[PDB]
Amino acid sequence: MTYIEKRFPEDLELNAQFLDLVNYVYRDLTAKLEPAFLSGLRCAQPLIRAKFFEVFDNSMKRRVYERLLYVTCSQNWEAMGNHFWIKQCIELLLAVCEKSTPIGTSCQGAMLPSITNVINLANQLHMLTNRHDKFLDTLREVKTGALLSAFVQLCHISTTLAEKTWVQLFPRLWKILSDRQQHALAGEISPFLCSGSHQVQRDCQPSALNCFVEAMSQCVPPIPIRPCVLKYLGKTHNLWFRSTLMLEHQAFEKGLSLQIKPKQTTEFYEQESITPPQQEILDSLAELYSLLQEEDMWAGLWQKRCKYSETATAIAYEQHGFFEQAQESYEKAMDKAKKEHERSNASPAIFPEYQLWEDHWIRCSKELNQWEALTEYGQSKGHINPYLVLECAWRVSNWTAMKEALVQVEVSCPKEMAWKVNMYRGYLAICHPEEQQLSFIERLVEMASSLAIREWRRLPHVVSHVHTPLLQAAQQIIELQEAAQINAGLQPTNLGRNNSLHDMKTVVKTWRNRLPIVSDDLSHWSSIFMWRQHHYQGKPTWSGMPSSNNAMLGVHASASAIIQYGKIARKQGLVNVALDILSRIHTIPTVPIVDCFQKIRQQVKCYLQLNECMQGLEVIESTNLKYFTKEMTAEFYALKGMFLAQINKSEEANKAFSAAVQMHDVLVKAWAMWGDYLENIFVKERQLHLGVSAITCYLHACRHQNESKSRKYLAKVLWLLSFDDDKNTLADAVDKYCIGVPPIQWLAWIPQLLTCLVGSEGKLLLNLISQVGRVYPQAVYFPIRTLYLTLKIEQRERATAPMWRCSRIMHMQRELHPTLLSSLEGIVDQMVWFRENWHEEVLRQLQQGLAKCYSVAFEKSGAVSDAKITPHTLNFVKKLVSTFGKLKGQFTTDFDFSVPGSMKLHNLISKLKKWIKILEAKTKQLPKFFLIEEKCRFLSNFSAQTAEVEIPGEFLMPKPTHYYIKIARFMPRVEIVQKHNTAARRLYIRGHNGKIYPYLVMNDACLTESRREERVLQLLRLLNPCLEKRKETTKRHLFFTVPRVVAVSPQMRLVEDNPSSLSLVEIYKQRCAKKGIEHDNPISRYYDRLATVQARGTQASHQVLRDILKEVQSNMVPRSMLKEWALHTFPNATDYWTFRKMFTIQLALIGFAEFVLHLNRLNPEMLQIAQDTGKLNVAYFRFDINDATGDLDANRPVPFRLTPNISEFLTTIGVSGPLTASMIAVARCFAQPNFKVDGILKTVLRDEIIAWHKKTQDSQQLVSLVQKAVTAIMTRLHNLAQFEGGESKVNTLVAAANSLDNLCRMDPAWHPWL
Amino acid sequence: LKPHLHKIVNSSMELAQTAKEPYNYFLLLRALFRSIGGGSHDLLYQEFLPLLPNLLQGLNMLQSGLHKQHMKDLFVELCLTVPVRLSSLLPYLPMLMDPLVSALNGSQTLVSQGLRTLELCVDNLQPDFLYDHIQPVRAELMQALWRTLRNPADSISHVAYRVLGKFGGSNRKMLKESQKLHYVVTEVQGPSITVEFSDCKASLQLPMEKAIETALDCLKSANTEPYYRRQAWEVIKCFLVAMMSLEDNKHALYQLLAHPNFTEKTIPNVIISHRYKAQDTPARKTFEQALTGAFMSAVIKDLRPSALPFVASLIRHYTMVAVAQQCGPFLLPCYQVGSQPSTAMFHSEENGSKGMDPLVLIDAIAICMAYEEKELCKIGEVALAVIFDVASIILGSKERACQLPLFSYIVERLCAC
Amino acid sequence: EWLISEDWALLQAVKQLLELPLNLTIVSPAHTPNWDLVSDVVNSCSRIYRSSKQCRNRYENVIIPREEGKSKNNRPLRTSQIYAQDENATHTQLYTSHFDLMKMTAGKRSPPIKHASVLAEPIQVASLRAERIA
C-alpha cells in the first residue's frame, strides 16, 4: 500500500485498481490503512473520489457539530502531505445539507421578477404559452442537491476557490451552533493548531493551516488564542502580518494600552504578575516586530514599556546613529542595573529588558568596528557565545577560532539561519588555516542559494525590510564564488599565467564597482571590504620577489578598499572610526602617490567635518617635501583655503584660491569655495566691483559639473542677481562669463527666470531664456503662454514691455519648431471643449462661498449669532447672481442671493447648504460618459506621426537621462468625476511605451492664488533629491511624492492623477450616507450648541469646547470610521499592514512640511490617499503669509493634523514610533551645513513674496524681507534637529498635536473630530 | 543572402500590419533571426546594422498592444534574440527594456530567455552605465525579479537570485513606487443560495461570486477536463434558475400576453444608454459573468446538446419579461411616455431596479461577442435572432418590435465594442 | 549547562499548550505533540537557543525522571519547587556577570582612544579669469 505509490506515482491505472481494492476492504482491525484511504479521498479521478467519500460520509452522524468535531479531534490530517484538506472539510460539512428542497435565495433584491409580477406592481401566442409552460415546469423541479454536488468539484480543482469558500463558510457555520457547544469546540481548537501533525505544511505557500486561522479570525464571538502560539504561527505558516494584527488587537483591547510603567517596578504595583499576563502578549509582539526589521515600530513599543530611563535614551541614540553614544548609554544602563541587582531580587519581569541591552550593545559595538573586542567577549571565559565568534573572528586576522567555532554551531542547526553556515564553510574552504583544494565550493554556494530561496518563499508577499537580509546576502554569496575562481587561478600551475592575469584584472575591475548602497549598515560594508581585503593581501605575497606590477595591482586594490571603506565610514558620521581605518594605511610600505593623496584628502575632510585646525594644517604642509604629483597641489591648496576660511583667515585664503586656480582651472570645488568666501564678503560692505568675483566663480563651477551638484550654485547666482544696481554690471559679468554653461541646468529654474525677466532691465536677461527655449521648446513654452496671457488679462481688465518680451520669445522660437508649437496650440485650443454645464458652474462658486463664509463664522465664533456678511463675501454673492442670474433655478437663486445676501450670516449659510443639496442631487441624472469623437476632433486624430510631444509635465525636473516619453494617442473616452471643489473631467493618454496615463483638466479662477501652489510644489520637488544623500532618510524610504502639474493656461491647467484616490472627507461621506443623516451635522451641532450656550449670557469657555468635541465624537463621529473602512477595504492582512505603514510614513513628511515651512493648514478634503499604494499627496499647500505684512508666520493651535480618527487607525505605537523618527531624521538631514539649503529658499521665497507685494503694494527692502523670512524657516528647523537631553522637540509637538486641549479649539471646518 | 535582406525584413514588417493571418510573417522573422545569428555571419551583421533603429522600434511598438497571448509571446521573443553582438547595441538599449520586463511575466520559456538576456548584459555593461539605462523601468523590473523567486521551477529562481546578487546595492535601492495593493470598493456582498438543515431547523446562506468566477474561468480555459466543464455548467444553470422567480401559471401568462395594448397602443420613444449606468454592482457583475458562462457552454461541444435548448428558453423568458416591463397595460414609470436614459434602468445599490433588470442579458451578449474566440459570435447572433423573433411574435409586427426601447440599448452597447 | 529556567519553561509549555498528558498519551488523534513550538517558547527566554531535538532530549532524559517522583533521586521535589525557589540566583548572576564582563571589555584594549607659476602677489583675482583661457 505504501510502496506502490512513492516510487511509482506516474501510473494512473495500477493505482486505480489498488485504490479500488483499498476502498472495497473498508466495507468489511485491518482498518489501519488510513494513509491510503486518505490518499484515495484526494485522488484526481472523480469516480474514485466519489467512491471513497461514499463510505467516508457514512462513518459519521447527520449533524453539523459532530462533523466539525471530527475535523478537529477525531481525525489526523498528517496522512496527506502538500494536499489542502480544506476541500475534504468542505465536502464533509456540506454533505449534511438538505438535497430534496427546491432552490431558493434571500436576495429578493437580486431576484429576476416574474412576467406576471408586473400585474402585482399595479394562435402562435398560445403555442408559445404552452412551450413556455413546459419549460417552466422542467425548470421548476430542480433541487439544490444539484448545486451542492457540483460546487465541491470546482472547489477540488481550484485551491483559491476552496480557501475563500472556507473563509466565508466557517463563520456562518459558527453561528449555527448554540453557545453550549460553541465553547466546547473553541476549547479544543487551540490544541488543534499547536499539533505537530501540521508541520509538513510548513513550506506550502497556501498552507491548509494558514487558511484555517484566517477563517477563524472572522468567527463572530472572537475565538480565544494563546498569545505565544501566534508568534510561532507567524514564524512558520507565513501568517506574519495577520498574527501581528491579532496581537495588536488583543494588546489595545485587553490591556487597553501598553504596560506604560510610569515609575519603578518596586512601586509600579499595577504589574499584572511577576511574569505578568498581558505582558507576554507585549513581548511576543515586540519579537515579531524585531524579526520583521520594523525597528521603528519596535522602538516605539520599547519606549513605551521600558522600566529604566537609560534604555530609552540608548534606543533613541541608536535609532538615529550616534553609535558611540548608544554604546555608552547601554553600558551605563547595565552598570546602574548591576548596582541594584547586587542587593535586590531578580524580578523576572525585566528579563527581556535585560537581554535587550546585551543584544544592542553587541549590535552597536560591531558597527563601530570593535571586532577584536567582540571576538574576545564571544569567547568569554564562561557563558560563551559561539555564533558571535563565528561572525566576527574571520574579519580579524584570526583563522582558528572560527575553525573551532563551527563544530558546535552546526549541531545547533538553527534552521531558517542555515544558509549562513553553509556559506561560511566556504570562507574556511578558501582562506583555510592551512590550505584547501577549494574544488567543492560550487556545491556549497549552490546549496546556500537554494536554501536562501526556500526561506524567501516563506516571507510575506510584498517586499519590505524583512526581505533585506536575503537581497543583502546574494552579493556576498556571489563574491565568495568569485573569489574562489580567482584563488583557483592562484594555484601554482595557473599562478603567474596570463590567462589568470586576465581573470584577476577582470574580477578586480568588477569588484571596484559593484558596491552596496549607503543605507546598508557599516557592519555589512565591513563584511564585503574585509572579504575583498583578504584576497587583495594574497596577491602581493606570491608577487613579492621582474618588475611584476601584479603586486602593485594588489597594493592598489587593498589601498582603494581601505580608503573607500573609510570614506563611507565618514559619510555616515563616524569620523573617529573613519580616522582609524584610514590611518591603518600606514602599515603598507609601498603605496601609489595618488593613494597617499586620497588618504590625506580623506583625513583632512574628517578634520573639517568635526576643531582640529592645526592637524589639518600639519597633515597638508607635512606633504610634498620635494614633489607630489602636480594636479592635487591645487587640491591641498583649496583645502587649505577652506580651512583658512573656516577660521578667521581672510587674505591668505584668497592667495590660496588664487594658487589653486593657478594651473588647471578645472577644480570645481575650488571655485565653489572661492565664491562662497567672496559672497560672504559681499553680503556686507558691498564694494560691488568685488561682487562679480562670486558670480564668475559659481558660473565656472557649474560650467564643468553638470545636471546636479550645480543647482545650489545656480541658486546662489540668481540670489546675487538681486543686488545688481542700475549700472547692471552683474548682468555684464553674467553675459561675459555665463558663456557655455549648458542649458540643461536652467530647466529647474524656469519660473524664477521668468519672474526675474518680467522685472526691470530684463532685456539683458532675455538672452538666456532665448538660449534655453531654442534647445528645449516644450519646456519654456507653456510657462510663457501662461505668463503672457496673465499680463494680457491684467493690463486689459485694468502692448507692454513685459508682454513685448514674452512675444519676442514666443514668435522668435516659432521660427524654430513651428510644427511642435502648432501641435501644442492645437491640443490646448481643443481642450476648451471640456467646459462644464451650468450645474457645475454654479456648484463650484457655491462651494467657494461656503468655505469663505465658514472661515468668517469661525472668525466670529463665540460672538453674535447675528453676525453680518463681510463686504468681500457680499461682493462674491453679488457676482454669483450677476454671472448666473432652468426656469426654477434662475428664478429662485436671484431672489435668494445678491443683495439679499446681507442680513444674518447663519441663515444665509443654511440657504446655501440647501441650495447645494438640491443642485447636487439634480446632478445625479447627468451622463457619466462621453467620447472624444463627438464635440471635438483634432485630439482623436492625434498620433505620433503629427509631432513628438512629451507627456505633459516631463520637463518639470531636468535629468541627464533621456527618460522622455512621447504621446502616442489620446484615448477615445473621458470621464466626469466628483471632487473636493469641482468635477473636473478626466482623460486618458497613451504614451509611446504603451502605458496609460490618466490626467485631470482642472479650471479655476483667481490665477494669482493658483500660481503659488506650483511654487511650493517646485520647492518640494527641488528638495526631494537631498533626501537620497543620507542613511537615516534612505533607510525608511522618505520622499515627498509631488504630483505633476503644468500651467496650460491661466484659467485652467493639467495635473497628473490616478483613480482610486480619494480624500478623508470622501470616506466620511460614504459612511455617513450609509446612515440616515448628512455630512454637515457635526458643524451644525458645534455651532448650534455654542449659540445656545451663548444665548444664556455665557461667553465661550474651554470646557464647553472640549465637551462639544467629545460629544460629537461620541455620537455622530465615532473614531473608528477610518480604521473600519481600512478594515473592510483591505480584508487581506499584508495589504492592510503595508498600506498602514506607508500611510504613516507619508503623513510624517506631510506634517513636517506643514510645520517647518509655515504652510497653510491641512483640511480634510485637502488630503488625498491612494488606495492602490497608500501614498499621500496634498491638495496644493501654499505658503501662509499675512496680508498686512510678509512676516511669514503660522501659529495655529495644532502644528499639524493628527485628528483622533487618524490616530486610532495608526494606533498608539505607530504615532510614537515611525512618525517621530521620520520627522527627526528629516530635520537632521536638512540641517546639514554641507547642503546649501540657504539659496534654495532665498530664491523661492524671494519669488514668493513678490506675489504678496503685488496683491498689495522693489528694492533692498525685498532683499531684507526675504532674508528675514528665511530665518524663520532656519529657526523652526534648527530648533527641532538638535540632539540633547530632551532628544528632540518633536516629542513636545507630536504630543501637542493630538492633545484635546489643542484640537477642541480648532476651527470646526478643520474637522478636529475627523 | 546579403542582398535583399532589407526587403525580406521591411516588406514583411509592412505587410504584416494587414492580413488575416499575420502570424506567419513573425514566424519567418524568428527563423531569420535564429539562422543569421550564432556566429554564422561576418558580413550579415554589417548588412543588418542599419535595420536596427527601425526594426527594433517597430517590434517594441508591436509588443505593447493587446494581441492574443501567443502573438504577444512571439513579439517579446522576437524583440529579444535580435542578431546583434553585445557591444554596439548600446544606442538602442533603452528601447528593449519594456519587452524584457514583459518577458519576465510570461511563460517559463519567456522568463528563462529574459533572465538570460538580463544576466548577459549585466556581466559586461559597467554597472553605472547599465543602471543609468535601467532607471526608466527599474520600478517594475525589480518587482518582476522579486516575484520570480517564488517560481516553482527552481531552475528559474536560482538564476534570478544570482542576477539579484550580481547587482550591487542597486538590487534593493529605493523604488519610487510601492507595490500595488488589492482592495475592495463595494461595501455590499454578492448573491447567496439557501441551504438548510434539520439541526435546530436553521438555514444557511452562502455566496458564490468567486464560485461563478472560477466556473467562468474553467469554461474559458483551453485545457480543463470535460468533467469539470460539465460541473461548471451545472453550477451556472442552477444559479440562473435560482436567481429567477417561477411563479405564474398558464392563464396568468396567457391572459397578459394576449392583452390589447400589446399590438394596438403606441410604443413610447424611450431612449436607453449605458452612459447613465452607475457601476457594475456585484449582483449585476456576477449575473453577467454567469450568463457569459452559459453562452460559452452552448457553443462548446458535448455541452451544446443540453445547453442550447436551455439558453434559448432563457432568452425567450428574458425578452418576455423585458418587454412586459416596457410595454403593454402595466409598464414601469422608468419607461413612461416622458423619460430620459435614467439610472433607474439598471440595478444599482440605492435604486434597486425593481429586482434585477433583464438588460444584463445584452451586456452578456456584448461581452461574449467581444471575447477573443470569435466562435461565440455564432451564438450571439442566434440570441439576437431569438430576441427579435419573440418581440415580433408578441407585438404583432417586426416594425413594432424595432421601436421597442431595448433595441436602443442593444445598438449602443454593441457599437461600444 | 541548562538551567532550571529552561526546564520549567518547557515543562509548562508541554503541559499547557499541547494540552497533553505528561506521559504524552495522545488522548485524541488530532493533537500530536509539536517540539518546534516548545523549542521556540523555551528559546524565547534561554540565553542561547537549542534545537527542538535538544528540547525533547532534555525532556525525556531529565524531566520525565524528575517529574515522576519515584526516581531514586532522593524523592526529588520536581522542577516546580526548584523554579519557585530559584527566582534570583540564576537570573541575576548570569546577567550581572555578563554586564561586568563586557564592562571589562569596554575597558580592555583601551577606553576607546614653486610649480610652473605661483605667487602673482591680488590683481590676479579678476584678470586671471580671462587671461588663463590662452
PDB file of C-alpha atoms in Angstrom, chain A residues 298 301 581 622 679 962 975 1049 1061 1297:
ATOM      1  CA  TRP A 298       9.817  48.041  17.781  1.00  0.00           C
ATOM      2  CA  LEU A 301       6.996  49.758  21.587  1.00  0.00           C
ATOM      3  CA  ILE A 581      40.527  52.904   9.271  1.00  0.00           C
ATOM      4  CA  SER A 622      53.896  67.992   6.030  1.00  0.00           C
ATOM      5  CA  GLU A 679      29.843  86.075  -1.268  1.00  0.00           C
ATOM      6  CA  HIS A 962      16.847  60.905 -21.934  1.00  0.00           C
ATOM      7  CA  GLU A 975     -14.865  60.590 -17.611  1.00  0.00           C
ATOM      8  CA  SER A1049      -3.466  78.428 -19.453  1.00  0.00           C
ATOM      9  CA  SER A1061      -7.515  58.186  -4.989  1.00  0.00           C
ATOM     10  CA  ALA A1297      -0.903  67.796  18.017  1.00  0.00           C
TER      11      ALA A1297
END
